[PDB]
Amino acid sequence: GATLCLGHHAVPNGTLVKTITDDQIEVTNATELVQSSSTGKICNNPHRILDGIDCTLIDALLGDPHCDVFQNETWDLFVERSKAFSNCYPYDVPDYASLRSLVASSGTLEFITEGFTWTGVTQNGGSNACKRGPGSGFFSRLNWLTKSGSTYPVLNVTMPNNDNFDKLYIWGVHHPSTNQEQTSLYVQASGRVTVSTRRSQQTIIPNIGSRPWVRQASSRISIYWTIVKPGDVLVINSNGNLIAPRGYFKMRTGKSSIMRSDAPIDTCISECITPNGSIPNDKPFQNVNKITYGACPKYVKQNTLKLATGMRNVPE
Amino acid sequence: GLFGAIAGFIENGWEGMIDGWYGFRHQNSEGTGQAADLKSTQAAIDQINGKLNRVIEKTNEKFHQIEKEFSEVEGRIQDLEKYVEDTKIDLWSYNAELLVALENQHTIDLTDSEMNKLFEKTGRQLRENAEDMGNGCFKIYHKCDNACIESIRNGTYDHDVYRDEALNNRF
Ligand SMILES: *[C@@H]1O[C@H](CO)[C@@H](O[C@@H]2O[C@H](CO)[C@@H](O[C@@H]3O[C@H](CO)[C@@H](O)[C@H](O[C@H]4O[C@H](CO)[C@@H](O)[C@H](O)[C@@H]4O)[C@@H]3O)[C@H](O)[C@H]2NC(C)=O)[C@H](O)[C@H]1NC(C)=O
Ligand SMILES: CC(=O)N[C@H]1[C@H]([C@H](O)[C@H](O)CO)O[C@@](O[C@@H]2[C@@H](O)[C@H](O)O[C@H](CO)[C@@H]2O)(C(=O)O)C[C@@H]1O
Ligand SMILES: *[C@@H]1O[C@H](CO)[C@@H](O[C@@H]2O[C@H](CO)[C@@H](O)[C@H](O)[C@H]2NC(C)=O)[C@H](O)[C@H]1NC(C)=O
Ligand SMILES: *[C@@H]1O[C@H](CO)[C@@H](O)[C@H](O)[C@H]1NC(C)=O
């Protein structure tokens, strides 16, 4: 008669996978679900990547002279480098993290100058701590006010928001090292800065005292921010120590963010970005970095997970 | 697997079969041969492609999130930020482990199942003209030249043609 055998294929070198019942069992084939490698490079498409180079987002915001190239820049992803440095008047930002976040998320440094009237003070103060060309200078977006003649009057100014968008105002307060410096610059023995809207108010008293010497000064500036909504009004009131805004930053909402990375930027296309570089997004999981931006595989702790793409391998 | 064909009553696979996943080996008067079954092979592949495409389906695109590395010690708020991310990562790591485990058990069972389907279909085709040897092979109880074998494989084999002949050899 005849014999007819039913059967299935096999291969000489199978792959091990995990199941409900077995932590290793051999199948004919599998595919990797965890992306574990990067090129080491951040692709410049399709997201608008802005390399901060020597500049933090905050220094570009304030207008540190070596960050002037960033004026009115926009981004989907601002990349901060570990080599970045400040090179202007020494400053702090109470709630630095929040200011950095909100600006990063806004995705723009578009600045609109406004005609503030500062009656009876000297404008455009600068310092050798913050050189602009050969001479002393200052943050481009801030206006250091000091006495005119022998007086610093009460400054009291308003700027209404008659636009249909939110305005972000960056301003500050100067902290002298000595009483001599305080009175020299602002006349009054103790200054005061009050910035308000209809909805909110911030009042800051300067503190006089030495801090450690940084880029020529034991003094400091502290940076604050105020958002003004359509139909609201900014009021600024001060009898000394005001580091005045020159205008506002336009705010947006959208997909913008910021990332700390030293990966070089390259000409290529990748939806997913990590600090290690761009990664492909064909796999559902990744083990490269929990910090990601874009259409990315989800971060998991496993460096490999095999999905079986074939039957059980039972060789000859 | 659940059906007990692959790594079960079929003792092993065929490294020689390179043109399909399941198929036939015969011995008759004219010699021996081997042919892949295309419909079983495709049923298995189609199902595996199906699940593959479901799994590699891009679901998430994220933009501004929370910070996940910190250069200074801060305490409470940072503790919470880290804990939120760690919690998330563990839940996703678990989802991934479970997913592959369930997927792979099911892939093994469904490939085992398709082998079994092909075996039961062939058995039914042969009616009373053959018997199950128990190792995935049918002893056919009549003369089955290459034309006859190809008839079983391509679905045309009329069992009534060979029934008298085969019933005789069986009993
Ligand atoms: C510093 O700058 C701010 C911002 O401009 C400035 O605020 C303004 O104060 C004046 C009063 O000093 C406000 O004027 C009021 O406007 C409302 C309508 O909007 C009127 O109804 C008010 O009239 C009554 O009060 C008058 C003043 O006493 C009376 O003479 C009158 O009879 C009414 O009873 C009044 O005119 C103005 O609205 C604000 N502006 C804003 C934008 O808020 C503030 O005065 C300055 N401070 C100092 C110390 O100089
Ligand atoms: C706006 C203004 O007054 N600018 C001054 C500046 C400030 O008075 C000062 O930064 C306040 O802390 O001072 C400048 O001169 C400095 C000296 O005041 C300081 O004692 O020593 C510095 C050198 O280490 C420096 O010479 C400045 O910062 O360059 C002069 C500037 O016009
Ligand atoms: C991606 O970058 C991260 C961040 O540096 C790498 O994480 C480091 O990995 C090494 C292990 O070789 C450790 O010594 C570091 O302590 C890790 N740092 C952190 C913050 O986790 C990660 O290994 C990189 N991955 C790839 C594939 O390049
Ligand atoms: C299995 O699938 C892989 C894709 O990872 C393919 O390259 C290979 O030829 C297929 N079969 C194997 C390895 O048996």
Coordinates of C-alpha atoms and ligand atoms in Angstrom, one line a residue:
Chain A
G1 CA 0.0 0.0 0.0
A2 CA 1.3 3.4 1.1
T3 CA 2.4 5.6 4.1
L4 CA 1.4 9.3 4.5
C5 CA 3.0 11.1 7.4
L6 CA 1.8 14.5 8.6
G7 CA 4.5 16.8 10.1
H8 CA 6.0 20.2 10.7
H9 CA 9.2 22.1 10.1
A10 CA 12.2 22.5 12.4
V11 CA 15.4 24.4 12.3
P12 CA 18.9 23.6 13.6
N13 CA 19.4 26.8 15.7
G14 CA 16.2 27.9 17.5
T15 CA 15.6 30.7 20.0
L16 CA 14.6 30.6 23.6
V17 CA 11.4 32.3 24.8
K18 CA 9.4 32.7 28.0
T19 CA 5.9 31.4 28.4
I20 CA 3.3 31.0 31.2
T21 CA 4.8 27.5 32.1
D22 CA 8.5 27.8 31.1
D23 CA 11.1 30.5 31.6
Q24 CA 13.1 29.1 28.6
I25 CA 11.6 27.0 25.8
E26 CA 12.8 26.7 22.3
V27 CA 10.9 28.0 19.2
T28 CA 11.8 28.2 15.5
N29 CA 12.0 32.0 15.6
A30 CA 11.4 35.1 17.7
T31 CA 11.5 38.9 17.5
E32 CA 12.9 41.4 19.9
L33 CA 10.4 43.7 21.7
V34 CA 12.9 45.9 23.7
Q35 CA 14.9 48.5 21.9
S36 CA 18.3 48.5 23.7
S37 CA 20.5 50.5 21.4
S38 CA 20.8 54.1 20.1
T39 CA 22.8 55.7 17.3
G40 CA 24.4 58.1 19.9
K41 CA 23.0 61.0 17.8
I42 CA 19.9 63.1 18.0
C43 CA 18.2 63.3 14.6
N44 CA 17.3 66.9 13.5
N45 CA 14.0 65.7 11.9
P46 CA 11.1 65.7 12.3
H47 CA 11.2 67.7 15.5
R48 CA 12.6 71.2 15.6
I49 CA 15.8 70.7 17.7
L50 CA 17.5 73.7 19.3
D51 CA 21.0 73.1 20.6
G52 CA 21.6 75.3 23.6
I53 CA 25.4 74.9 23.0
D54 CA 27.0 77.0 25.8
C55 CA 23.5 78.2 27.1
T56 CA 20.8 77.0 29.5
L57 CA 17.3 77.9 28.5
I58 CA 17.2 80.3 31.4
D59 CA 20.3 82.2 30.3
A60 CA 18.9 82.4 26.8
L61 CA 15.6 83.7 28.3
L62 CA 17.3 86.4 30.4
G63 CA 19.7 87.4 27.6
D64 CA 23.1 86.5 28.9
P65 CA 25.4 88.1 26.1
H66 CA 26.9 84.8 24.9
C67 CA 23.3 83.6 24.5
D68 CA 22.1 86.5 22.4
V69 CA 22.0 84.2 19.3
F70 CA 18.9 82.6 21.0
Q71 CA 16.8 85.7 20.8
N72 CA 13.2 84.9 19.6
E73 CA 14.2 81.3 19.0
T74 CA 11.6 78.5 18.9
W75 CA 11.8 74.7 19.4
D76 CA 10.1 71.5 19.8
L77 CA 13.0 70.3 21.9
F78 CA 15.6 72.6 23.6
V79 CA 18.7 70.6 24.3
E80 CA 20.8 71.7 27.3
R81 CA 24.5 70.7 27.3
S82 CA 26.6 69.8 30.3
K83 CA 29.3 72.3 29.1
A84 CA 26.8 75.2 29.4
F85 CA 27.8 78.2 31.6
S86 CA 26.5 81.5 32.8
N87 CA 28.6 84.6 32.0
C88 CA 26.6 87.6 33.2
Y89 CA 25.6 89.1 36.6
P90 CA 25.3 86.3 39.2
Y91 CA 21.7 85.4 39.8
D92 CA 19.3 82.9 41.3
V93 CA 15.8 81.9 40.4
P94 CA 13.6 80.9 43.3
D95 CA 11.7 78.0 41.7
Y96 CA 14.2 77.8 38.8
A97 CA 12.7 74.4 37.9
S98 CA 9.2 75.8 37.4
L99 CA 10.4 78.8 35.3
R100 CA 12.5 76.5 33.1
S101 CA 9.6 74.1 32.7
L102 CA 7.0 76.7 31.8
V103 CA 9.3 78.3 29.3
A104 CA 10.4 75.0 27.8
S105 CA 6.8 73.9 27.4
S106 CA 5.9 77.3 25.8
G107 CA 8.4 76.5 23.0
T108 CA 9.4 80.1 22.2
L109 CA 11.5 83.1 23.4
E110 CA 9.6 85.6 21.2
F111 CA 10.0 88.9 23.1
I112 CA 7.9 92.0 22.5
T113 CA 9.4 95.3 23.8
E114 CA 7.1 97.6 25.6
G115 CA 7.4 101.3 26.4
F116 CA 7.8 101.4 30.1
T117 CA 8.4 104.9 31.6
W118 CA 10.8 104.9 34.5
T119 CA 10.7 108.5 35.6
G120 CA 13.6 109.9 37.6
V121 CA 16.0 106.9 37.3
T122 CA 19.0 106.0 35.2
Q123 CA 18.4 103.1 32.8
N124 CA 20.5 100.5 31.1
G125 CA 22.8 99.8 34.0
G126 CA 25.6 97.2 33.4
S127 CA 28.5 95.4 34.9
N128 CA 31.9 94.0 34.0
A129 CA 30.5 90.7 35.2
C130 CA 28.4 90.8 32.0
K131 CA 30.4 92.1 29.1
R132 CA 28.7 92.9 25.8
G133 CA 31.5 93.6 23.4
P134 CA 34.4 95.3 25.2
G135 CA 32.3 97.3 27.7
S136 CA 30.2 96.5 30.7
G137 CA 26.7 95.1 29.9
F138 CA 23.7 93.3 31.2
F139 CA 21.0 90.7 30.4
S140 CA 19.4 91.9 27.2
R141 CA 15.8 91.5 28.5
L142 CA 16.3 93.3 31.8
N143 CA 16.8 96.9 32.6
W144 CA 18.9 97.7 35.6
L145 CA 17.6 100.9 37.1
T146 CA 19.7 103.1 39.5
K147 CA 19.5 106.7 40.8
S148 CA 19.4 109.8 38.6
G149 CA 21.4 112.6 40.2
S150 CA 21.0 112.0 43.9
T151 CA 17.4 110.6 44.1
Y152 CA 15.5 107.4 43.3
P153 CA 11.8 108.2 43.5
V154 CA 8.9 105.8 43.9
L155 CA 8.6 104.0 40.6
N156 CA 4.9 103.3 39.8
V157 CA 4.0 102.0 36.3
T158 CA 1.3 100.1 34.6
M159 CA 1.2 98.0 31.4
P160 CA -2.3 96.7 30.4
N161 CA -2.7 93.5 28.4
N162 CA -5.0 94.5 25.6
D163 CA -3.9 91.5 23.4
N164 CA -5.8 88.2 23.2
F165 CA -2.8 86.1 24.4
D166 CA -1.0 85.7 27.8
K167 CA 2.1 87.8 28.5
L168 CA 5.1 86.4 30.5
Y169 CA 7.1 89.1 32.3
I170 CA 10.5 88.4 33.6
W171 CA 11.9 90.8 36.3
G172 CA 14.2 90.8 39.2
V173 CA 15.5 92.2 42.5
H174 CA 19.0 93.3 43.2
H175 CA 20.6 92.2 46.5
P176 CA 23.6 94.4 47.4
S177 CA 26.6 93.1 49.4
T178 CA 26.8 96.2 51.6
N179 CA 24.7 99.1 52.9
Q180 CA 27.2 101.4 51.1
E181 CA 26.3 99.7 47.7
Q182 CA 22.6 99.9 48.5
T183 CA 22.6 103.7 49.2
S184 CA 25.1 104.4 46.4
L185 CA 22.9 102.8 43.8
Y186 CA 19.3 103.3 45.1
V187 CA 19.5 106.1 47.8
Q188 CA 16.9 104.5 50.1
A189 CA 18.5 102.4 52.8
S190 CA 16.1 99.5 52.1
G191 CA 14.5 98.9 48.7
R192 CA 11.3 97.1 47.8
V193 CA 9.8 95.6 44.6
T194 CA 6.0 94.9 44.3
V195 CA 4.7 93.4 41.0
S196 CA 1.0 92.8 40.8
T197 CA -2.1 92.0 38.6
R198 CA -5.8 92.2 39.6
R199 CA -5.4 88.5 40.5
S200 CA -2.0 88.3 42.2
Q201 CA 0.8 90.2 43.9
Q202 CA 4.4 89.5 44.7
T203 CA 6.5 91.7 47.1
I204 CA 10.2 91.1 47.5
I205 CA 12.4 92.9 50.0
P206 CA 16.1 93.0 49.1
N207 CA 18.5 91.4 51.5
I208 CA 21.8 93.1 52.0
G209 CA 24.9 90.9 52.6
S210 CA 27.8 89.2 51.1
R211 CA 27.4 86.0 49.1
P212 CA 30.4 84.2 47.6
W213 CA 32.3 86.1 44.9
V214 CA 31.1 85.0 41.4
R215 CA 32.2 86.7 38.2
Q216 CA 33.3 89.9 40.1
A217 CA 30.3 90.4 42.5
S218 CA 29.4 89.3 46.0
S219 CA 26.0 90.7 45.1
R220 CA 23.1 88.8 43.4
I221 CA 20.0 89.3 41.4
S222 CA 16.9 87.2 42.1
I223 CA 14.6 86.5 39.1
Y224 CA 10.8 86.4 39.3
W225 CA 8.1 86.0 36.8
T226 CA 4.5 87.2 36.4
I227 CA 1.9 86.1 33.8
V228 CA -0.7 88.7 32.7
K229 CA -3.9 87.4 31.1
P230 CA -6.0 89.2 28.5
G231 CA -7.9 92.1 30.1
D232 CA -5.7 92.2 33.2
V233 CA -3.0 94.7 34.0
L234 CA 0.6 94.6 35.3
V235 CA 1.6 97.1 37.9
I236 CA 5.2 97.5 39.1
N237 CA 5.9 99.6 42.2
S238 CA 9.4 100.1 43.7
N239 CA 11.5 102.5 45.7
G240 CA 14.8 100.7 44.9
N241 CA 16.5 97.5 43.7
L242 CA 14.1 96.9 40.8
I243 CA 15.6 95.0 37.8
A244 CA 12.9 96.0 35.4
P245 CA 11.4 94.1 32.5
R246 CA 11.8 95.6 29.0
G247 CA 8.7 93.9 27.7
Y248 CA 7.1 90.4 27.7
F249 CA 7.6 87.0 26.2
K250 CA 4.8 85.5 24.2
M251 CA 3.5 82.2 25.5
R252 CA 2.2 79.2 23.6
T253 CA 0.9 75.8 24.4
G254 CA 1.9 72.7 22.3
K255 CA 4.4 69.9 22.1
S256 CA 7.6 71.7 23.2
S257 CA 9.9 70.4 25.9
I258 CA 13.5 70.4 27.1
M259 CA 16.1 67.7 27.5
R260 CA 19.6 67.4 29.1
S261 CA 21.9 65.6 26.7
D262 CA 25.4 65.7 25.3
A263 CA 24.6 63.7 22.2
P264 CA 25.6 65.4 18.9
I265 CA 22.8 66.5 16.5
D266 CA 22.8 64.8 13.1
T267 CA 20.9 65.0 9.8
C268 CA 18.4 62.0 10.0
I269 CA 14.8 61.3 10.8
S270 CA 13.7 59.8 14.1
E271 CA 10.4 60.3 15.9
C272 CA 11.8 59.2 19.3
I273 CA 14.6 61.1 21.1
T274 CA 16.5 60.1 24.3
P275 CA 19.5 61.7 26.0
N276 CA 21.6 58.9 24.6
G277 CA 20.4 59.8 21.1
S278 CA 17.5 59.0 18.9
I279 CA 16.1 55.4 19.0
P280 CA 13.9 53.6 16.5
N281 CA 10.2 53.2 17.6
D282 CA 9.2 49.9 15.8
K283 CA 9.4 48.0 19.1
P284 CA 6.8 48.5 21.9
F285 CA 9.4 48.7 24.7
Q286 CA 12.8 50.2 25.3
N287 CA 15.5 50.0 27.9
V288 CA 17.7 52.9 26.7
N289 CA 16.4 55.7 28.9
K290 CA 13.4 56.5 30.9
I291 CA 13.8 60.1 29.7
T292 CA 12.2 60.3 26.2
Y293 CA 10.6 62.8 23.8
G294 CA 8.3 61.9 20.9
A295 CA 6.6 58.8 19.6
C296 CA 8.6 56.4 21.8
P297 CA 8.6 52.8 23.0
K298 CA 7.7 52.6 26.7
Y299 CA 10.6 52.3 29.1
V300 CA 10.9 48.9 30.9
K301 CA 13.7 47.4 33.0
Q302 CA 14.2 44.3 30.9
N303 CA 17.0 44.5 28.3
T304 CA 15.4 41.8 26.2
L305 CA 12.0 40.3 25.7
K306 CA 11.4 37.8 22.9
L307 CA 8.0 37.4 21.2
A308 CA 7.8 33.9 19.6
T309 CA 7.2 34.2 15.8
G310 CA 7.1 30.4 15.3
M311 CA 6.2 27.0 16.7
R312 CA 8.0 24.9 19.2
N313 CA 11.4 23.7 17.7
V314 CA 11.8 20.0 17.9
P315 CA 14.9 19.1 15.8
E316 CA 15.9 15.8 14.2
Chain B
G1 CA 1.1 22.3 23.7
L2 CA -2.5 21.8 24.5
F3 CA -3.2 19.6 21.5
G4 CA -0.2 17.3 22.0
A5 CA 0.9 17.0 18.3
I6 CA 4.0 19.2 18.1
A7 CA 6.5 17.8 20.6
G8 CA 3.7 15.2 21.3
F9 CA 2.5 12.3 19.0
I10 CA 4.6 13.8 16.2
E11 CA 8.1 12.9 17.5
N12 CA 10.0 15.7 15.9
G13 CA 10.1 18.3 13.2
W14 CA 11.6 18.2 9.7
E15 CA 14.7 20.4 9.1
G16 CA 14.4 19.4 5.4
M17 CA 11.0 21.2 5.0
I18 CA 12.0 24.7 4.0
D19 CA 9.0 25.7 1.8
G20 CA 6.4 25.5 4.5
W21 CA 5.6 25.1 8.2
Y22 CA 3.4 22.0 8.0
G23 CA 3.2 19.2 5.4
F24 CA 3.3 15.7 4.0
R25 CA 5.9 12.9 3.7
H26 CA 4.9 9.7 1.8
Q27 CA 6.2 6.3 0.8
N28 CA 4.4 4.5 -2.1
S29 CA 5.4 2.2 -5.1
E30 CA 7.0 5.1 -7.0
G31 CA 9.3 6.1 -4.0
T32 CA 9.4 8.8 -1.4
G33 CA 8.7 12.5 -1.4
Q34 CA 7.8 15.6 0.6
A35 CA 5.4 18.6 0.1
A36 CA 4.5 21.6 2.2
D37 CA 0.8 22.2 3.0
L38 CA 0.2 25.9 2.1
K39 CA -3.2 26.4 3.8
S40 CA -2.1 25.3 7.3
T41 CA 1.2 27.1 7.0
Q42 CA -0.7 30.3 6.0
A43 CA -3.3 30.0 8.8
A44 CA -0.5 29.9 11.4
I45 CA 1.5 32.7 9.8
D46 CA -1.6 34.9 9.3
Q47 CA -2.4 34.5 13.0
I48 CA 1.2 35.3 14.1
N49 CA 1.3 38.3 11.8
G50 CA -2.0 39.4 13.3
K51 CA -0.6 39.3 16.9
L52 CA 2.7 40.8 15.9
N53 CA 1.0 43.8 14.3
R54 CA -1.2 44.3 17.4
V55 CA 1.9 44.3 19.7
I56 CA 4.1 46.6 17.6
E57 CA 1.2 49.1 17.2
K58 CA 2.6 52.5 18.2
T59 CA 0.3 53.7 21.0
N60 CA 2.2 56.5 22.9
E61 CA 3.7 59.8 22.0
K62 CA 4.7 62.0 24.9
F63 CA 6.2 65.5 25.0
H64 CA 6.8 67.6 28.1
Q65 CA 6.7 65.3 31.2
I66 CA 8.4 65.4 34.6
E67 CA 12.1 65.5 35.3
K68 CA 13.6 62.1 36.0
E69 CA 17.2 62.9 37.0
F70 CA 18.2 65.5 39.6
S71 CA 21.6 67.2 40.3
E72 CA 20.6 68.4 43.8
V73 CA 19.1 66.8 46.9
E74 CA 15.6 68.3 47.6
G75 CA 13.6 65.9 49.7
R76 CA 9.8 65.6 49.5
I77 CA 8.9 66.8 46.0
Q78 CA 11.8 64.9 44.4
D79 CA 11.0 61.8 46.4
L80 CA 7.5 61.9 44.9
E81 CA 8.7 62.6 41.4
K82 CA 11.1 59.6 41.5
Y83 CA 8.5 57.3 43.1
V84 CA 5.9 58.3 40.5
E85 CA 8.4 57.3 37.7
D86 CA 9.7 54.1 39.4
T87 CA 6.0 53.0 40.0
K88 CA 5.2 53.6 36.4
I89 CA 8.3 51.7 35.1
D90 CA 7.6 48.7 37.3
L91 CA 4.0 48.5 36.1
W92 CA 5.1 48.8 32.5
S93 CA 7.8 46.2 33.1
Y94 CA 5.2 43.8 34.5
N95 CA 2.8 44.5 31.6
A96 CA 5.6 43.6 29.1
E97 CA 6.6 40.4 31.0
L98 CA 3.0 39.2 31.2
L99 CA 2.4 40.1 27.5
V100 CA 5.2 38.0 26.1
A101 CA 4.4 35.1 28.4
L102 CA 0.7 35.0 27.4
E103 CA 1.5 35.7 23.7
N104 CA 4.2 32.9 23.6
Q105 CA 2.1 30.3 25.3
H106 CA -0.7 31.1 22.9
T107 CA 1.6 31.0 19.9
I108 CA 2.9 27.6 20.9
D109 CA -0.7 26.3 21.4
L110 CA -2.0 27.8 18.1
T111 CA 0.8 26.3 16.0
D112 CA 0.2 22.9 17.8
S113 CA -3.5 23.4 17.0
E114 CA -2.9 24.0 13.3
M115 CA -0.8 20.8 13.0
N116 CA -3.7 18.9 14.7
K117 CA -6.3 20.5 12.4
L118 CA -4.3 19.4 9.3
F119 CA -4.0 15.9 10.8
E120 CA -7.7 15.5 11.6
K121 CA -8.7 16.9 8.2
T122 CA -6.4 14.3 6.4
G123 CA -7.8 11.5 8.6
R124 CA -11.3 12.5 7.7
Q125 CA -10.4 12.7 4.0
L126 CA -9.2 9.1 4.0
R127 CA -12.4 7.7 5.6
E128 CA -12.1 3.9 5.9
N129 CA -9.2 3.6 3.4
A130 CA -6.5 4.3 6.0
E131 CA -5.6 3.9 9.7
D132 CA -3.8 6.2 12.2
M133 CA -0.5 4.6 13.2
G134 CA -0.3 7.0 16.2
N135 CA 2.9 8.9 15.3
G136 CA 1.3 11.3 12.8
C137 CA 1.3 8.7 10.0
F138 CA -1.5 7.0 8.2
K139 CA -1.0 3.6 6.8
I140 CA -3.0 3.7 3.5
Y141 CA -4.5 0.3 2.6
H142 CA -4.4 0.6 -1.2
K143 CA -2.1 1.4 -4.1
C144 CA -1.5 5.2 -4.0
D145 CA 0.6 6.3 -6.9
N146 CA 2.0 9.9 -7.0
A147 CA -1.3 11.1 -8.7
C148 CA -3.2 9.6 -5.7
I149 CA -0.9 11.2 -3.1
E150 CA -1.1 14.6 -4.8
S151 CA -4.9 14.1 -4.8
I152 CA -4.9 13.7 -0.9
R153 CA -2.6 16.8 -0.6
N154 CA -4.6 19.1 -3.0
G155 CA -8.0 18.0 -1.6
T156 CA -9.4 16.0 -4.6
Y157 CA -9.0 12.4 -3.3
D158 CA -12.3 10.6 -3.7
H159 CA -12.3 7.8 -1.1
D160 CA -15.1 5.8 -2.8
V161 CA -12.7 5.0 -5.7
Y162 CA -10.4 3.0 -3.5
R163 CA -12.8 1.9 -0.8
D164 CA -13.5 -1.8 -1.9
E165 CA -9.8 -2.2 -2.5
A166 CA -8.9 -0.8 1.0
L167 CA -11.6 -2.5 3.1
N168 CA -10.4 -5.8 1.7
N169 CA -6.7 -5.2 2.7
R170 CA -7.8 -4.1 6.2
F171 CA -10.1 -7.0 7.0
Ligands
LIG1 C1 0.3 103.7 40.9 O1 -0.2 103.2 39.6 C2 -1.5 102.6 39.6 C3 -1.8 102.1 38.2 O2 -2.2 103.2 37.3 C4 -2.4 103.7 40.1 O3 -3.7 103.1 40.1 C5 -4.8 103.9 39.7 O4 -5.3 104.6 40.9 C6 -6.4 105.5 40.6 C7 -6.7 106.3 41.9 O5 -5.5 106.7 42.6 C8 -7.6 104.7 40.1 O6 -8.6 105.6 39.7 C9 -10.0 105.2 40.0 O7 -10.6 104.7 38.8 C10 -12.0 104.3 39.0 C11 -12.6 103.8 37.7 O8 -11.8 102.8 37.2 C12 -12.8 105.5 39.6 O9 -14.2 105.1 39.9 C13 -12.2 106.1 40.8 O10 -12.9 107.3 41.1 C14 -13.1 107.5 42.6 O11 -11.9 107.7 43.3 C15 -11.2 109.0 43.0 C16 -9.8 109.0 43.6 O12 -9.9 109.1 45.0 C17 -12.2 110.1 43.4 O13 -11.5 111.4 43.2 C18 -13.5 110.0 42.7 O14 -14.4 111.0 43.2 C19 -14.1 108.6 42.8 O15 -14.6 108.5 44.2 C20 -10.7 106.4 40.6 O16 -10.6 107.5 39.7 C21 -7.2 103.9 38.9 O17 -8.2 103.0 38.5 C22 -5.9 103.1 39.2 N1 -5.5 102.4 38.0 C23 -5.4 101.1 37.8 C24 -5.0 100.6 36.5 O18 -5.7 100.3 38.7 C25 -2.1 104.2 41.5 O19 -3.0 105.2 41.9 C26 -0.7 104.7 41.6 N2 -0.3 104.8 43.0 C27 0.3 105.9 43.5 C28 0.6 105.8 45.0 O20 0.6 106.9 42.8
LIG2 C1 24.4 99.9 37.2 C2 25.7 100.0 38.0 O1 25.8 100.6 39.0 N1 26.8 99.4 37.4 C3 28.1 99.4 38.0 C4 28.3 98.2 38.9 C5 27.4 98.0 40.1 O2 27.4 99.2 40.9 C6 27.8 96.8 41.0 O3 27.9 95.6 40.1 C7 26.8 96.5 42.1 O4 27.2 95.3 42.8 O5 29.7 98.1 39.3 C8 30.8 98.1 38.3 O6 32.0 98.3 39.1 C9 32.3 97.2 40.0 C10 32.6 97.7 41.4 O7 31.4 98.4 42.0 C11 32.9 96.5 42.3 O8 33.2 97.0 43.7 O9 34.1 95.9 41.8 C12 33.9 95.3 40.5 C13 35.2 94.7 40.0 O10 35.4 93.4 40.7 C14 33.5 96.4 39.5 O11 34.6 97.3 39.2 C15 30.8 96.9 37.5 O12 30.1 95.9 37.9 O13 31.5 96.8 36.5 C16 30.6 99.4 37.5 C17 29.1 99.5 36.9 O14 29.0 100.7 36.1
LIG3 C1 21.8 55.8 28.2 O1 22.2 56.9 29.1 C2 22.0 56.5 30.4 C3 22.3 57.8 31.3 O2 23.7 57.9 31.4 C4 22.9 55.3 30.7 O3 22.7 55.0 32.1 C5 24.0 54.8 32.7 O4 24.5 53.5 32.4 C6 25.7 53.1 33.0 C7 25.8 51.5 32.7 O5 26.8 51.3 31.7 C8 25.8 53.4 34.5 O6 27.2 53.3 34.9 C9 25.3 54.8 34.8 O7 25.2 55.0 36.2 C10 23.9 54.9 34.2 N1 23.2 56.2 34.6 C11 21.9 56.3 34.8 C12 21.4 57.7 35.2 O8 21.1 55.4 34.7 C13 22.5 54.1 29.9 O9 23.3 53.0 30.1 C14 22.6 54.5 28.4 N2 22.1 53.4 27.6 C15 22.6 53.2 26.3 C16 22.0 52.0 25.6 O10 23.4 53.9 25.8
LIG4 C1 12.7 34.6 11.4 O1 12.4 35.9 11.5 C2 13.6 36.7 11.4 C3 13.3 38.1 11.7 O2 13.8 38.4 13.0 C4 14.1 36.4 10.0 O3 15.3 37.2 9.8 C5 14.5 34.9 9.8 O4 14.9 34.6 8.5 C6 13.3 34.1 10.1 N1 13.4 32.7 10.4 C7 14.3 32.1 11.2 C8 15.5 32.7 11.8 O5 14.1 30.9 11.4

